[PDB]
């Protein structure tokens, strides 16, 4: 798949809004993820013990990982599909170190779209959400194909 320049623009516009508060959005997304798909929290050795949303919210470690996730994602989106270099190390660690099934990347994709919709209704209408969704689908597709080359699930 391939996004048009129109589509990239919709994604980068809402993204520029996200980047006004990386840590806040990170936290919101990860929390959404953990609340919606609690099995995912188990993958995080450092924060697997967190029992409630309040505990999630007060975790400095959780807030650091949200910033890490978003910074890496942002760098990929800003590539506008030319992300081969960035995907390599992410695919390797997620497939062989962390062991993250594609299914889990679909779950965070869902948390991403949920938070953007909630926080940026003005810049996240139906066309922008379509474009975001295509952007993440490309990402997931390309990561799935690297998983396969690495010898893991796809
Ligand atoms: C938006 C898709 C994702 C991005 C861009 C992302 C990015 C990253 C980055 C940049 C790191 C640190 C470097 C590394 O280990 O490669 C990281 C670590 C990690 N990721 Fe992700 N990740 C994503 C999805 C997920 C999901 C869905 C999970 C689990 C459900 C996951 C689990 C982990 C874990 C367990 C680590 C190590 C945390 C620690 O330091 O113990 N990742 N991720």
Instruction: Kindly give the number of the ligand 1 atom that is closest to the alpha carbon of 108.
Output: 27
Domain that holds residue 103: 1-154
Residue 129 CA from chain centroid, whole number: 14
Name the CA dihedral angle for 85, 87, 89, 94, rounded to a multiple of 10 degrees: 180
Binding site membership of 73 for ligand 1 (Cβ less than 6 Å): yes
69 ligand 1 Cβ < 6 A:
yes
CATH number at residue 122: 1.10.490.10
Spacing, Cα 123 to ligand 1 middle (Å): 27
Contact 95, 145 (CB under 8 A): no
- Output 135-138 pairs: Cβ under 8 A, ≥24 positions apart: 135/3, 135/7, 135/8, 135/11, 135/77, 136/109, 136/112, 137/1, 137/109, 138/1, 138/2, 138/3, 138/81
Method: X-ray
The total number of structural domains in the chain stands at 1
């Amino acid at each position: 798949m391939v996004l048009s320049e129109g589509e990239w623009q919709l994604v980068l516009h809402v993204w520029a809004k996200v980047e006004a508060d990386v840590a806040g959005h990170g936290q919101d997304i990860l929390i959404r993820l953990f609340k919606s798909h609690p099995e995912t929290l188990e993958k995080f050795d450092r924060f697997k013990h967190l029992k409630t949303e309040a505990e999630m919210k007060a975790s400095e470690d959780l807030k650091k990982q949200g910033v890490t996730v978003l910074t890496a994602l942002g760098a990929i989106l800003k590539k506008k599909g030319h992300h081969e270099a960035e995907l390599k190390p992410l695919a390797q660690s997620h497939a062989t170190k962390h062991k993250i099934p594609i299914k889990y990347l679909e779950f965070i994709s869902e948390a991403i779209i949920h938070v953007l919709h909630s926080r940026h209704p003005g810049n996240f209408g139906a066309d922008a959400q379509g474009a975001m969704n295509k952007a993440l689908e490309l990402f997931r597709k390309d990561i799935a194909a690297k998983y396969k080359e690495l010898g893991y699930q796809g």
